[PDB]
Amino acid sequence: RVLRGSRLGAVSYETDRNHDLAPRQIARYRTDNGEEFEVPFADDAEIPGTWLCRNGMEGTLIEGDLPEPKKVKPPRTHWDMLLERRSIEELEELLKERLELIRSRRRG
């Protein structure tokens, strides 16, 4: 009849030692729209330049050590869906067709 469950999280029991801790660093991260966030890192820790801040947008490191900006590609354009299946000469034929069309529409 009795039923139990478990929140999947460890419950450890030590004392809240306020005095003796691992010493730590503080790194200032800045987002795009002039927002400052200071993140407590450890001493023995490399400080990453890029960061997802408390703001939720991307926040960079306040010293300009220049992480790599994009190094990526655009996914696929509608131009790419067109160009992978058509000819540029064909598109030129359609363009000159529509140009002569707006010609015949506009001045006679």
Partner 1 sequence: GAMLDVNFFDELRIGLATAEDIRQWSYGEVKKPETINYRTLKPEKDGLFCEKIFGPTRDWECYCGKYKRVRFKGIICERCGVEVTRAKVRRERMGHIELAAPVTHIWYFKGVPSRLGYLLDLAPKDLEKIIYFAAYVITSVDEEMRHNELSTLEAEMAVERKAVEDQRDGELEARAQKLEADLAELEAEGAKADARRKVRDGGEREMRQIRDRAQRELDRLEDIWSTFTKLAPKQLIVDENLYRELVDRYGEYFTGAMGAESIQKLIENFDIDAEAESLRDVIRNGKGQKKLRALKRLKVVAAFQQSGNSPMGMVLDAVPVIPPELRPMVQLDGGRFATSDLNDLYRRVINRNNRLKRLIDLGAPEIIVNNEKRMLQESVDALFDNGRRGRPVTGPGNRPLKSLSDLLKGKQGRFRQNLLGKRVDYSGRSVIVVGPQLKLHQCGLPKLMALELFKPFVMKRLVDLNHAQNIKSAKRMVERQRPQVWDVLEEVIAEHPVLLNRAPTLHRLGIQAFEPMLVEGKAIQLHPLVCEAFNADFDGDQMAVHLPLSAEAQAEARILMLSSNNILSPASGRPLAMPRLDMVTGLYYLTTEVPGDTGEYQPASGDHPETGVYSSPAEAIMAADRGVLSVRAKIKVRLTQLRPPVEIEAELFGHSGWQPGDAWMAETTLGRVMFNELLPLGYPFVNKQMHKKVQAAIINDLAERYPMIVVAQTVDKLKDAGFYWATRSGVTVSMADVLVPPRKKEILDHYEERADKVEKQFQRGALNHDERNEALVEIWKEATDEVGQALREHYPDDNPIITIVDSGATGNFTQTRTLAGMKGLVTNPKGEFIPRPVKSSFREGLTVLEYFINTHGARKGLADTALRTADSGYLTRRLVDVSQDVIVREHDCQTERGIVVELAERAPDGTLIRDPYIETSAYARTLGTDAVDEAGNVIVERGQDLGDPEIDALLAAGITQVKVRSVLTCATSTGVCATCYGRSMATGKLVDIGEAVGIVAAQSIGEPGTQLTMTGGLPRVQELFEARVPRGKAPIADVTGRVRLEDGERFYKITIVPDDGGEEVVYDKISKRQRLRVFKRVLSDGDHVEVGQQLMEGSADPHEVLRVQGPREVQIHLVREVQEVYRAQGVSIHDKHIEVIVRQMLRRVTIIDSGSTEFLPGSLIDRAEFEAENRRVVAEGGEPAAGRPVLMGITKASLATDSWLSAASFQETTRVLTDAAINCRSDKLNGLKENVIIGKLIPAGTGINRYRNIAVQPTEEARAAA
Partner 2 sequence: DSEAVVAVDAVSFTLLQDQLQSVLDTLSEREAGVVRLRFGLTDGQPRTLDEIGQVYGVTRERIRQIESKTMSKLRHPSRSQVLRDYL
Partner DNA sequence: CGAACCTGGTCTTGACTCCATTGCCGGATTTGTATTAGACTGGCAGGGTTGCCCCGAAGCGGGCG
Partner DNA sequence: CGCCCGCTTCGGGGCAACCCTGCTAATACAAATCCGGCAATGGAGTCAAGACCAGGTTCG
Does 7 participate in binding partner 1 (rule CB under 8 A)? yes
Contact (CB, 8 A) for 48 and 25: no
Report the nearest approach of DNA to the CB of residue 76 (Å).
Answer: 6
Contact (CB, 8 A) for 55 and 31: yes
Q: Which residues are CB-contacts of 55 (< 8 A; sequence separation ≥ 6)?
A: 31, 35, 37
Does 23 participate in binding partner 2 (rule CB under 8 A)? no
Which spans of this chain sit near DNA (rule: CB under 7 A)? 75-76, 81
Which spans of this chain sit near partner 1 (rule: CB under 8 A)? 3-17, 20-22, 24, 39-42, 45-48, 52, 54-57
